[PDB]
Amino acid sequence: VRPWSEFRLTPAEAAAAAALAARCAQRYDETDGPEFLLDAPVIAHELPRRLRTFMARARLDAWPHALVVRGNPVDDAALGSTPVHWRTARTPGSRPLSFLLMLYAGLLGDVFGWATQQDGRVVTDVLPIKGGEHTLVSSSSRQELGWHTEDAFSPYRADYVGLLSLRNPDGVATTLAGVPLDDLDERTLDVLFQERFLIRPDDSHLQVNNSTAQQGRVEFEGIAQAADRPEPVAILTGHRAAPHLRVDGDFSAPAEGDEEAAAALGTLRKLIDASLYELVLDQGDVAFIDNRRAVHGRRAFQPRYDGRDRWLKRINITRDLHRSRKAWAGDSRVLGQR
Ligand SMILES: N=C(N)NCCCC[C@H](N)C(=O)O
Ligand SMILES: O=C(O)CCC(=O)C(=O)O
Ligand SMILES: [Fe+2]
């Protein structure tokens, strides 16, 4: 069996999708522009029909931890070298594939970014940054990126996290885990459903990991407030027979003094560690991880820094943009609170 739902494009289907993405790259200035953000979900209706059928059906299945699409061609010569930093990572060689990710994402929901992550970009980059090997962010390498719900701190966190592998020559694995429902006893389960846990914002929302500028400044105040004064929240929500999950291995904690909550979180850590499995996104593979059913991470790897490091494009997707209207800056798709 497979804990995720998988689709493999035929070469003709893959070529057609690539051609559509190239057409979009020709007609629009950028992926994050207001025009393409609005048009992408409608343009996505032109994608191969079998793919559209897969995305419409697979999103509605009860079981998958992710939707995986294999077989998008990528030419390393045309792509160019892996950028040394996310700031300069919008290279012409990666441009069509960024449009492709956006088109696929449009079939699943509304895309958005954060004013406090990678300068408010909607399509972001995952690549190893020299000197940042042992950090808690996605540009780490030598230190494993521990399992987490994406943006667990925030009620406006994505429903799906999309990852498109531009290159991954050494087959470094993305990690995944669902709710360990086969092992959680009912008392522990009960406690995890109660608002007895603290979840702070991760290091990607700190000013040090964004560019020096006077734009998207006030949104860092809300991040500080979530870090300093986290309100108690639940880890599990919804149906007891199929709970949704909100946890971060490195940023979760029990409510102060709450030893029963602590025991439940401790047990959850153990059970998630034991059931964590691997998904290798080879060059051209795309994954849309269900951020409510599963946590994810990335295995430790030795970075190359020779121009051919592992490199992903990434995007946040919500089923309903209006859920986060508090955090709207204006008419943009960039979230953050004061
Ligand atoms: N357990 C950890 N490390 N949690 C934080 C994960 C960081 C993900 C973030 N969007 C990034 O791009 O770094
Ligand atoms: O590198 C990966 O496969 C996933 C990285 C990740 O968890 C993220 O960017 O949020
Ligand atoms: Fe993540």
Short mmCIF file of all heavy atoms in Angstrom, two decimals, residues 4-42:
data_model
loop_
_atom_site.label_atom_id
_atom_site.label_comp_id
_atom_site.label_asym_id
_atom_site.label_seq_id
_atom_site.Cartn_x
_atom_site.Cartn_y
_atom_site.Cartn_z
N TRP A 4 -0.07 7.83 0.64
CA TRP A 4 -0.42 9.00 -0.17
C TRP A 4 -1.06 8.56 -1.49
O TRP A 4 -0.95 7.39 -1.88
CB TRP A 4 0.82 9.85 -0.46
CG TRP A 4 1.86 9.13 -1.26
CD1 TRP A 4 1.88 8.94 -2.61
CD2 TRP A 4 3.04 8.48 -0.75
NE1 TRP A 4 2.98 8.22 -2.98
CE2 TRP A 4 3.71 7.92 -1.86
CE3 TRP A 4 3.59 8.32 0.52
CZ2 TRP A 4 4.91 7.22 -1.73
CZ3 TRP A 4 4.78 7.61 0.65
CH2 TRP A 4 5.43 7.07 -0.47
N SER A 5 -1.72 9.49 -2.17
CA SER A 5 -2.32 9.21 -3.48
C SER A 5 -1.38 9.68 -4.58
O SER A 5 -0.94 10.83 -4.57
CB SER A 5 -3.68 9.89 -3.60
OG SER A 5 -4.39 9.40 -4.72
N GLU A 6 -1.08 8.80 -5.53
CA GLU A 6 -0.06 9.06 -6.55
C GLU A 6 -0.62 9.03 -7.97
O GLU A 6 -1.45 8.18 -8.31
CB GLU A 6 1.06 8.03 -6.43
CG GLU A 6 2.25 8.30 -7.34
CD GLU A 6 3.53 7.60 -6.89
OE1 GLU A 6 3.75 7.46 -5.67
OE2 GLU A 6 4.32 7.21 -7.76
N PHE A 7 -0.13 9.96 -8.78
CA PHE A 7 -0.50 10.08 -10.19
C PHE A 7 0.78 10.23 -10.99
O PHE A 7 1.66 11.01 -10.61
CB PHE A 7 -1.38 11.33 -10.37
CG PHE A 7 -1.86 11.54 -11.78
CD1 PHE A 7 -3.04 10.96 -12.21
CD2 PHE A 7 -1.14 12.35 -12.66
CE1 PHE A 7 -3.50 11.17 -13.50
CE2 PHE A 7 -1.59 12.56 -13.95
CZ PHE A 7 -2.77 11.97 -14.37
N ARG A 8 0.92 9.47 -12.08
CA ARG A 8 2.07 9.62 -12.97
C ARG A 8 1.62 10.13 -14.33
O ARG A 8 0.86 9.46 -15.03
CB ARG A 8 2.85 8.31 -13.12
CG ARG A 8 4.04 8.44 -14.08
CD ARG A 8 5.04 7.31 -13.93
NE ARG A 8 5.89 7.45 -12.75
CZ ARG A 8 6.93 8.27 -12.64
NH1 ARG A 8 7.29 9.07 -13.64
NH2 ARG A 8 7.63 8.30 -11.50
N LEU A 9 2.11 11.31 -14.70
CA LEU A 9 1.85 11.90 -16.00
C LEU A 9 2.47 11.06 -17.11
O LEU A 9 3.60 10.58 -16.96
CB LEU A 9 2.44 13.30 -16.08
CG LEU A 9 1.84 14.37 -15.17
CD1 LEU A 9 2.87 15.43 -14.82
CD2 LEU A 9 0.62 14.99 -15.83
N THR A 10 1.75 10.89 -18.21
CA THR A 10 2.36 10.34 -19.42
C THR A 10 3.24 11.45 -20.00
O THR A 10 3.01 12.63 -19.71
CB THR A 10 1.32 9.93 -20.48
OG1 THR A 10 0.64 11.09 -20.97
CG2 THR A 10 0.31 8.94 -19.90
N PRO A 11 4.25 11.09 -20.81
CA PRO A 11 5.08 12.12 -21.43
C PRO A 11 4.29 13.19 -22.20
O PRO A 11 4.66 14.36 -22.17
CB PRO A 11 5.99 11.32 -22.37
CG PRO A 11 6.13 10.00 -21.68
CD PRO A 11 4.79 9.74 -21.05
N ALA A 12 3.22 12.77 -22.88
CA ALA A 12 2.36 13.70 -23.62
C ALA A 12 1.62 14.65 -22.68
O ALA A 12 1.56 15.86 -22.93
CB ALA A 12 1.37 12.93 -24.49
N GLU A 13 1.05 14.10 -21.61
CA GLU A 13 0.38 14.90 -20.57
C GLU A 13 1.35 15.86 -19.90
O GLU A 13 1.01 17.03 -19.66
CB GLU A 13 -0.22 13.99 -19.50
CG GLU A 13 -1.49 13.26 -19.91
CD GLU A 13 -1.91 12.21 -18.91
OE1 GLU A 13 -1.12 11.89 -17.99
OE2 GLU A 13 -3.03 11.68 -19.04
N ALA A 14 2.54 15.37 -19.59
CA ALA A 14 3.56 16.19 -18.95
C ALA A 14 4.00 17.33 -19.88
O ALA A 14 4.13 18.47 -19.45
CB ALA A 14 4.76 15.34 -18.55
N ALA A 15 4.23 17.00 -21.15
CA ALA A 15 4.58 18.00 -22.16
C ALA A 15 3.51 19.08 -22.32
O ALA A 15 3.83 20.26 -22.45
CB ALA A 15 4.84 17.32 -23.50
N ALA A 16 2.24 18.67 -22.30
CA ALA A 16 1.12 19.61 -22.42
C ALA A 16 1.07 20.58 -21.23
O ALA A 16 0.87 21.78 -21.42
CB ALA A 16 -0.20 18.86 -22.54
N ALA A 17 1.24 20.05 -20.02
CA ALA A 17 1.26 20.87 -18.81
C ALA A 17 2.43 21.86 -18.84
O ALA A 17 2.27 23.04 -18.50
CB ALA A 17 1.34 19.99 -17.57
N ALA A 18 3.60 21.38 -19.25
CA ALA A 18 4.78 22.24 -19.38
C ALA A 18 4.55 23.35 -20.40
O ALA A 18 4.90 24.51 -20.15
CB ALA A 18 6.00 21.41 -19.77
N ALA A 19 3.95 23.00 -21.54
CA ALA A 19 3.62 23.99 -22.58
C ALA A 19 2.68 25.07 -22.05
O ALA A 19 2.88 26.26 -22.34
CB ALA A 19 3.02 23.30 -23.79
N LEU A 20 1.67 24.67 -21.28
CA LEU A 20 0.74 25.62 -20.67
C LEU A 20 1.47 26.56 -19.71
O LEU A 20 1.26 27.77 -19.75
CB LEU A 20 -0.39 24.88 -19.94
CG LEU A 20 -1.47 25.73 -19.26
CD1 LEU A 20 -2.19 26.60 -20.28
CD2 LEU A 20 -2.45 24.84 -18.53
N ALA A 21 2.33 26.00 -18.87
CA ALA A 21 3.15 26.80 -17.94
C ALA A 21 4.04 27.80 -18.68
O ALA A 21 4.16 28.95 -18.28
CB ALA A 21 3.99 25.89 -17.06
N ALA A 22 4.67 27.35 -19.76
CA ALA A 22 5.51 28.21 -20.60
C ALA A 22 4.71 29.36 -21.22
O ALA A 22 5.19 30.49 -21.29
CB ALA A 22 6.19 27.39 -21.68
N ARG A 23 3.50 29.04 -21.67
CA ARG A 23 2.57 30.04 -22.20
C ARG A 23 2.27 31.11 -21.14
O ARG A 23 2.30 32.31 -21.44
CB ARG A 23 1.26 29.37 -22.65
CG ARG A 23 0.44 30.19 -23.64
CD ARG A 23 -0.88 29.49 -23.97
NE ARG A 23 -1.90 29.70 -22.94
CZ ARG A 23 -3.09 29.10 -22.91
NH1 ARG A 23 -3.44 28.23 -23.86
NH2 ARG A 23 -3.94 29.37 -21.93
N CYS A 24 2.00 30.67 -19.91
CA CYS A 24 1.77 31.59 -18.79
C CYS A 24 2.99 32.45 -18.48
O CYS A 24 2.87 33.64 -18.22
CB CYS A 24 1.34 30.82 -17.54
SG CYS A 24 -0.25 29.98 -17.69
N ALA A 25 4.17 31.82 -18.50
CA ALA A 25 5.43 32.54 -18.29
C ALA A 25 5.64 33.63 -19.35
O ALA A 25 6.19 34.69 -19.06
CB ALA A 25 6.60 31.57 -18.29
N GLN A 26 5.19 33.35 -20.58
CA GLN A 26 5.27 34.30 -21.69
C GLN A 26 4.30 35.47 -21.51
O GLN A 26 4.64 36.62 -21.82
CB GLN A 26 4.99 33.58 -23.01
CG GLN A 26 5.14 34.44 -24.26
CD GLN A 26 4.67 33.72 -25.52
OE1 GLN A 26 4.71 32.49 -25.60
NE2 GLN A 26 4.23 34.50 -26.51
N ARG A 27 3.09 35.18 -21.03
CA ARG A 27 2.01 36.18 -20.98
C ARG A 27 1.97 37.04 -19.71
O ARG A 27 1.45 38.15 -19.75
CB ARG A 27 0.66 35.49 -21.21
CG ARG A 27 0.52 34.92 -22.62
CD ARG A 27 -0.74 34.10 -22.80
NE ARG A 27 -0.79 33.51 -24.13
CZ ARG A 27 -1.81 32.79 -24.61
NH1 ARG A 27 -2.89 32.55 -23.87
NH2 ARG A 27 -1.75 32.30 -25.85
N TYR A 28 2.51 36.53 -18.60
CA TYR A 28 2.49 37.27 -17.33
C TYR A 28 3.90 37.65 -16.89
O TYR A 28 4.86 36.95 -17.21
CB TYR A 28 1.82 36.42 -16.24
CG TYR A 28 0.37 36.10 -16.53
CD1 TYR A 28 0.02 34.99 -17.28
CD2 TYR A 28 -0.65 36.93 -16.06
CE1 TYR A 28 -1.30 34.69 -17.56
CE2 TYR A 28 -1.98 36.64 -16.33
CZ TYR A 28 -2.30 35.52 -17.08
OH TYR A 28 -3.61 35.23 -17.36
N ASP A 29 4.01 38.75 -16.15
CA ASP A 29 5.31 39.22 -15.65
C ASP A 29 5.86 38.34 -14.53
O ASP A 29 7.03 37.98 -14.53
CB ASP A 29 5.23 40.67 -15.17
CG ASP A 29 5.07 41.66 -16.32
OD1 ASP A 29 5.26 41.29 -17.49
OD2 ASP A 29 4.76 42.84 -16.03
N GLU A 30 5.00 37.98 -13.57
CA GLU A 30 5.42 37.16 -12.42
C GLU A 30 4.29 36.29 -11.89
O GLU A 30 3.11 36.54 -12.15
CB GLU A 30 5.95 38.06 -11.30
CG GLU A 30 5.07 39.26 -10.98
CD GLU A 30 5.37 39.90 -9.64
OE1 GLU A 30 6.20 39.37 -8.87
OE2 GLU A 30 4.76 40.95 -9.35
N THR A 31 4.67 35.25 -11.15
CA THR A 31 3.70 34.31 -10.57
C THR A 31 2.89 34.97 -9.45
O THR A 31 1.71 34.66 -9.27
CB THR A 31 4.39 33.06 -10.00
OG1 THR A 31 5.38 33.44 -9.04
CG2 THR A 31 5.05 32.25 -11.11
N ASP A 32 3.52 35.87 -8.71
CA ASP A 32 2.90 36.50 -7.54
C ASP A 32 2.18 37.80 -7.85
O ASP A 32 1.67 38.46 -6.94
CB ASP A 32 3.96 36.77 -6.47
CG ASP A 32 4.65 35.50 -6.01
OD1 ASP A 32 4.38 34.42 -6.56
OD2 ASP A 32 5.46 35.60 -5.07
N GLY A 33 2.15 38.19 -9.13
CA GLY A 33 1.41 39.38 -9.53
C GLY A 33 -0.08 39.18 -9.32
O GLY A 33 -0.57 38.05 -9.35
N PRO A 34 -0.82 40.29 -9.11
CA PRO A 34 -2.26 40.17 -8.90
C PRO A 34 -2.99 39.51 -10.07
O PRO A 34 -3.97 38.79 -9.85
CB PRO A 34 -2.72 41.63 -8.72
CG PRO A 34 -1.61 42.47 -9.27
CD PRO A 34 -0.36 41.69 -9.04
N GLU A 35 -2.50 39.71 -11.29
CA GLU A 35 -3.13 39.16 -12.48
C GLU A 35 -3.10 37.64 -12.50
O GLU A 35 -4.14 36.99 -12.60
CB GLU A 35 -2.48 39.70 -13.76
CG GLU A 35 -2.67 41.19 -14.00
CD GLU A 35 -1.56 42.05 -13.42
OE1 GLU A 35 -0.79 41.57 -12.55
OE2 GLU A 35 -1.45 43.22 -13.83
N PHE A 36 -1.91 37.06 -12.40
CA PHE A 36 -1.78 35.61 -12.49
C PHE A 36 -2.36 34.88 -11.28
O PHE A 36 -2.83 33.75 -11.41
CB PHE A 36 -0.34 35.17 -12.72
CG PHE A 36 -0.22 33.71 -13.04
CD1 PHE A 36 -0.74 33.21 -14.23
CD2 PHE A 36 0.35 32.82 -12.15
CE1 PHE A 36 -0.66 31.87 -14.54
CE2 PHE A 36 0.43 31.47 -12.44
CZ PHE A 36 -0.08 30.99 -13.64
N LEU A 37 -2.32 35.51 -10.11
CA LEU A 37 -2.97 34.96 -8.92
C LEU A 37 -4.46 34.76 -9.18
O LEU A 37 -5.02 33.72 -8.83
CB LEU A 37 -2.75 35.86 -7.70
CG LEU A 37 -1.35 35.86 -7.06
CD1 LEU A 37 -1.14 37.09 -6.18
CD2 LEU A 37 -1.13 34.59 -6.25
N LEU A 38 -5.09 35.75 -9.80
CA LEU A 38 -6.52 35.67 -10.14
C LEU A 38 -6.82 34.69 -11.29
O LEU A 38 -7.83 33.98 -11.24
CB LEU A 38 -7.08 37.06 -10.47
CG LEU A 38 -7.23 37.99 -9.27
CD1 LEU A 38 -7.53 39.42 -9.71
CD2 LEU A 38 -8.32 37.48 -8.33
N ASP A 39 -5.96 34.65 -12.30
CA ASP A 39 -6.22 33.86 -13.51
C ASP A 39 -5.82 32.39 -13.42
O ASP A 39 -6.41 31.55 -14.10
CB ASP A 39 -5.48 34.46 -14.71
CG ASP A 39 -5.96 35.86 -15.06
OD1 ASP A 39 -6.88 36.39 -14.38
OD2 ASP A 39 -5.42 36.43 -16.02
N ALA A 40 -4.82 32.08 -12.60
CA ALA A 40 -4.25 30.73 -12.55
C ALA A 40 -5.29 29.61 -12.35
O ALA A 40 -5.23 28.59 -13.05
CB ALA A 40 -3.15 30.65 -11.49
N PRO A 41 -6.24 29.78 -11.41
CA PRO A 41 -7.25 28.73 -11.20
C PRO A 41 -8.14 28.47 -12.43
O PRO A 41 -8.61 27.35 -12.61
CB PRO A 41 -8.09 29.26 -10.03
CG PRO A 41 -7.21 30.26 -9.35
CD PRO A 41 -6.42 30.89 -10.46
N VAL A 42 -8.35 29.49 -13.25
CA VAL A 42 -9.13 29.35 -14.48
C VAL A 42 -8.27 28.78 -15.61
O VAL A 42 -8.72 27.91 -16.36
CB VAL A 42 -9.77 30.70 -14.90
CG1 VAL A 42 -10.48 30.58 -16.24
CG2 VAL A 42 -10.73 31.17 -13.82
#
